[PDB]
């Protein structure tokens, strides 16, 4: 139950990727899934477990911070933060999708040539039963309640009554008891993270690694180096320009990125994601409201993956893609689900949904054919997109934090 | 709202059994069900109510006990406890199933998938709030243990807002935990009504069936487990100090609820309160009475030892006498866990036939099986009551060690 | 399916059914990808196959007929 | 009646067999005592009847289906 720290993870990752990629090439991809996968799941299981307390509890406490600003500000900032990162991510994806040209081996052209309310999703933010909210998953209505509770607690402490001021403290302390308690567990889990990481990208490399070959591999290039370029050229440029030291950042954010990459789930890593912001030294009044509202509002990933994948399809059915009018489709994709990009496999869904809009429906058996290739590579393209999202989540936090 | 104590229960039980057995013989078994049953339910209702808080709350507090051992030990022990009780229960059932020979009047012979890992991963909930909300004992178990261990570690925090709140929560949780034991007696004041009404109906609607060759399975169960109590548990209570008759004294109410509620987990409030008043610490009984209710096999091993025989012998088969075990062991081992639900015994008995090669389709397999189903409730009462006796026995012995 | 090859689109069905036997099930999103391409061309490949069947039906008739 | 005796013959044993007795000889007694009594009493010769009705009875027994 001992041994080296987060190199133990990197030992799992590299050793897993190799042993999986090998094992699936020789076809045992199924056998890897029935024997290895469940140790990879038990890691994501334990992390999921925490996500509800550790957010709810942390954000009641995180409304002990100055409520009118801080939770009125920052929200305004961190919103506008993602606007100007996602903008850069879009043009970094397009200019990666021209750089690599994934549409040469297919080359197989088929003609063609050719509903969200929002208001009934805005009203969903406000839960009608916070107990159920928590119980039955749900991040973005639990966010709204916790903020509204901790603000209300703040106001109870300033009550001239001192039974009220009394109990007010009791609750908020007891809630912070939980909040803290969960961060304690998040390391208990992390001691199983090398087993978890090894077992996860063992399977994910067996069952979708072999596919990363040929013209399919030419999308994985323009994703993986396309986001590698989002880290270095967009985030570090923002960390440099806002004090906070770029390399000291990766130092602290090591474990949140290696979990985001492997769990492939934005929200499913928030316990680790948040604990890195504690140990980094941000206050709960920020990170408890910018790391969850990040996981569900962040578009850096989907803007960069449905920039190069939108190209692949448009170019594989042998189309112009209105080069430099890529954006018209890439922007409208992001904007169709600005929010709710946290779920794993979500990228594939919007990509399909765009085709409904493009006019090329998934029925057209060659549209469906090309799309199915992306689907044989989606998991690899999902890992990188989430890891670059949760890097972008902490970058957004640590910059806004080191302001307000 | 007053009157005598737990003799009031025994007044209900004997008076009910009689008035029900009488009333169903004269056919009003349905009328008993529409008039009596709902007072018998209201008892099981109120007990169920508590089961979640009283377990969750108690076990966060029960991780105030020394975590690395205690919740690392005992677990190792109480596991190995049930191994060596279930072993004895198996051979006590087989040697009860030969002693009584339930397969004479029939005599009517006809020819003739669990992953575990995807049930192990189910132990870890993905949302503790839901866990609690939507029933679920054995993932709530895992959380509470992990929480109270985490709280322990918060108290040893050099910070003293942290050390502060840490206390607040754990105290507040113990507020609840305790609060529930308070209710468990409030309920118990309705236990004579509850008991009377329950085994009134259960004796009306399945008592009349306890006749003939069917009765010859009820013999080898009821005296077969009566012999588990006396010869296996008292032998273990004697051999570990704790006084056998002073044990039944204290465990009176948990057994009379387990027998009548027929539900292992559905009695844990009373089961646990008997372990408080017995004097075991929460650090043990909060982890061995729920992990007992779901891991305990003493009952199913003894009921699908004699019922497995009844069917194999009623379709007129050898039953490979002395190779009973091959089937009886494989039954227990198919659901080592999750034997807590009422009626579960019938399910595995059926599931065994899938494995034996005699599928429930064969209209005489299905015929014999249906007789057991007209007697299952009587055979379930005894099996659960001997399970929850075995649960406390396991607790009080391990407790009086670690 | 020695028999019951008469229905239109049948060819695609067996082609899929073979993959069940080959060991490459239609779930594997690149198996399903290639198969889908054939499905975007099946009607063209079906016309020719049926016309050569009914030519073979009459050839079979006129030869056996000119015997018995 | 190879299959029907395999899949339900073995069951014709014990108290179950005691219903098969009172059916099979109970109807054997319907033939002889009720039908032949009516065939005798209406001319038509009883044994010349079974002669002719041999095949309809051995199909009814085995097809187990009146209309079939």
Numbering used by the authors:
A (entry chain C): 8 to 121, 127 to 416
B (entry chain A): 8 to 119, 127 to 416
C (entry chain E): 349 to 416
D (entry chain D): 213 to 280
Sentences from the paper on this structure:
Glutamate transporters, or excitatory amino acid transporters (EAATs), reside in the plasma membranes of glial cells and neurons, where they catalyze the re-uptake of the neurotransmitters glutamate and aspartate (L-asp). Key mechanistic and structural insights into this family of transporters come from studies on an archaeal homologue from Pyrococcus horikoshii, GltPh, which symports L-asp together with three Na+ ions; however, it shows no dependence on counter-transport of K+ under the conditions tested. GltPh, like EAATs, is a homo-trimer. Each protomer consists of a central scaffolding trimerization domain and a peripheral transport domain containing the substrate and ion binding sites.
To determine the structure of apo GltPh, we used R397A mutant that shows a drastically decreased affinity for substrate. However, removal of Arg397 may affect local electrostatics, potentially altering ion binding; thus these studies should be interpreted with caution. Apo GltPh-R397A also crystallized in an outward-facing conformation that is similar to the structure reported for a close GltPh homologue. The positions and orientations of the transport domains relative to the trimerization domains remain essentially unchanged in the apo and fully bound forms of GltPh-R397A and GltPhin. In contrast, the conformations of the transport domains themselves differ significantly. The conformational differences between fully bound and apo forms of the transport domain include a concerted movement of HP2 and TM8a, which form the extracellular surface of the domain, and local rearrangements at the ligand binding sites, involving HP2, the NMD motif and TM3. In HP2, the last helical turn of HP2a unwinds, and HP2a together with the loop region at HP2 tip collapse into the substrate and Na2 binding sites. Within the NMD motif, the side chain of Asn310 rotates away from TM3 and partially fills the empty Na1 site, while the side chain of Met311 undergoes an opposite movement, flipping away from the binding sites. Finally, TM3 bends away from the NMD motif, particularly around Thr92 and Ser93. The overall structures of the apo transport domain remain as closed and compacted as in the fully bound forms.
